[PDB]
A paper describes a structure:
Eleven [name]-related protein kinases (NEKs) are expressed in humans. At the protein level, it has been shown that [name] stabilizes the complex between ATR (ATM and Rad3-related) and ATRIP (ATR interacting protein) through phosphorylation, priming this complex for Chk1 phosphorylation. In this work we report the structure of the human [name] kinase domain in its apo form and in complex with an ATP-mimetic inhibitor. Overall, our structural model of the kinase domain will help the design of [name]-specific inhibitors as potential anticancer drugs and other [name] reported diseases.
All crystals grew from related conditions containing polyethylene glycol, and all belonged to the same crystal form. Inhibitor 1 was clearly visible in the experimental electron density and bound to [name] in the same manner as seen in the previous structures of this compound series bound to CDK2, 55. The 2-aminopyrimidine formed hydrogen bonds with the backbone nitrogen and oxygen of Cys83 on the kinase hinge region. The nitrophenyl group packed against the hinge residues Gly86 and Asp87, with the partial positive charge of the nitro group presumably forming favourable interactions with the negatively charged Asp87. The larger Phe135 residue of [name] forced 1 to bind with its 4-methyl-thiazole-2-amine in close proximity to the glycine-rich loop, while the gatekeeper Met80 of [name] (compared to Phe80 of CDK2) protrudes further into the ATP binding site and forces 1 to bind with its 4-methyl-thiazole-2-amine further out of the binding site. Whereas with CDK2 the inhibitor 1 can bind with its nitrophenyl group in two conformations, the different hinge geometry in [name], as well as the larger size of [name] Y82 compared to CDK2 F82, allows only one binding conformation. This conformation offers opportunities to expand the inhibitor from the thiazole ring to interact with Phe147.
Author numbering:
A (entry chain B): -20 to -17, -11 to 11, 17 to 284
B (entry chain A): -20 to -17, -7 to 10, 17 to 284
Write the structure that this text describes.
């Protein structure tokens, strides 16, 4: 080809023949049906063709991490494929929709504490699985937490990250949803596991109040409110344990926020874990495996 | 009955009124107002296998009788649950008794008189090849007259090591043996480790193995390193504590070997009649044959 996008530069990857029919956008995300057996899945599309060499090697690294992750409270990965300059990730469809919608469907009626806590413990178990492996999740949001047909909570897998840039996170938040921005990101400090904990706190607060903790009339004032750490208090009819946990997740200094392992060690949360994980999984993930930044 | 089983069991008409949770429940008989404890086990959501094993466990509980084991009164089944009725020990649990010292150490004679009673109870269970998954200070009680009783609920005919580890990561982890930490088989000597934890609590008013996380607790237990007992306790007692915390199960003494140590043996007569001594130590044989 006498050239001066060369042909044969499109990447092709596939692991199976299964074909999917597009039904609908749902957010990025597409609802599909398999032509094999009519089962529904969600596909996330990422453009690849306009990435550098480096960015493609990092996306490949991210997908391999997604592809190996398995936990009952994380959306289950099915396969991926590449064609036409995009990467596509296929995952299971959660028939109960996202928590964002579930919160709005209350139309102002507050959830019972036992429901808030049963959902919350599941989100914590998922996040433990991610954080134990030293993976950051950039997308702990009520729009990225889903319910299965039997009511099980699943954290969206898409959004995991091996490392995150603070300027880029801040920019993404101006453009998309800003409600989960941590103080440290607002001050251009490193994104860390406690920044995930802040976002977890935002989700918990949404579940307690049906509202975002940090809202304001402008992006710039939203940033100042987040740094000040001042939010409308949760209803006093919720237990002291729950109200106090909300306050701890919103500590201004990351190192004062509890780790997800520490949250799960609080008695009123710990006593629920047994409903959600098998003895084998409890033993393996709380006791027998070792996790470290050393390899 | 055109389509597209609940069992009922009782042994007496006696009715009980719920007073308070203490799934153990404090109840009063409507007959004479005497207090009892009832443990409720849900049965309707068990498999075939699990129900056959629960029934086997309750039959073992129901036939057990010893002055230092909480006395089984009766059981009944209704509404998809099994209920076990036992005596209420008015003095409460040893856990509370230990905390009530508010840092004041027990006299060695008091430690040993309690300890011998726990050992006699555990001998009775172990002689019959029964494991006890719940040798804990929260499951050892004092009667109104000060007699020590090991809680019966918690006996087991076999125990799964993964399940025991899981239960500990969720409930109390302070009694976990090194072998269970390494996911190796639960055995009689694992009960001996837990007996050692109770003895240590009685000697120091603290747990032998504490840590800032479940994961680090596991590492401390395997290392076998614990704060030494006060040197004002006898050499006999301090040396016994060390033997019960041997890392390898087979190096821990059997409960029969513990009862044979002179400073313990001389107390047995206060707690068992001659007939019971002869029967427990000399005459009734048990064997894994079958
Ligand atoms: C991973 C993911 N990203 C989205 N965007 S949606 C989505 C996803 C994944 C699994 N299941 C679902 N279920 C679902 C059902 C109904 C509605 C919505 N929703 O995002 O408004 C989501 N959605
Ligand atoms: C078998 C049993 N399981 C319980 N849980 S409590 C219990 C039991 C059995 C016999 N007697 C008692 N007495 C008692 C009295 C007072 C306080 C407590 N307590 O465990 O806080 C227990 N408790
Ligand atoms: Cl964490
Ligand atoms: Cl051994
Ligand atoms: Cl033994």
């Amino acid at each position: 080809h006498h050239h001066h996008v060369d042909l044969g530069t499109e990447n092709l990857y596939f692991q199976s023949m299964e074909k999917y029919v597009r039904l609908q956008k749902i957010g990025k995300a597409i609802l599909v049906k398999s032509t094999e057996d009519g089962r529904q899945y969600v596909i996330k599309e990422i453009n690849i063709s306009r990435m550098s060499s480096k960015e493609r090697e990092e996306s490949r690294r991210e997908v391999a991490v997604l592809a190996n992750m398995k936990h009952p409270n994380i959306v289950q990965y099915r396969e991926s494929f590449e064609e036409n300059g995009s990467l596509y990730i296929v995952m299971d469809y959660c028939e109960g929709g996202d928590l964002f919608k579930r919160i709005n469907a209350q139309k102002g009626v507050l959830f019972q504490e036992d429901q808030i806590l049963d959902w919350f413990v599941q989100i914590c178990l998922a996040l433990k699985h991610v954080h134990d492996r030293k993976i950051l999740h950039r997308d702990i949001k009520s729009q990225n937490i889903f319910l299965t047909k039997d009511g099980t909570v699943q954290l969206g897998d898409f959004g995991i990250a091996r490392v995150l840039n603070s300027t880029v996170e801040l920019a993404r938040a101006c453009i998309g949803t800003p409600y989960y921005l941590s103080p440290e990101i607002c001050e251009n400090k490193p994104y860390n596991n406690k920044s995930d904990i802040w976002a977890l706190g935002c989700v918990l607060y949404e579940l307690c109040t049906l509202k975002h903790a940090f809202e304001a009339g402008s992006m710039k004032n939203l940033v100042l409110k987040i740094i000040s750490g001042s939010f409308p208090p949760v209803s006093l009819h919720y237990s002291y344990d729950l109200r106090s946990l909300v306050s701890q997740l919103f500590k201004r200094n990351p190192r004062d926020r509890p780790s997800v392992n520490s949250i799960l060690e609080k008695g009123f949360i710990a006593k629920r874990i047994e409903k959600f994980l098998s003895p084998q999984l409890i033993a393996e993930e709380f006791c027998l495996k070792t996790f470290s930044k050393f390899g």
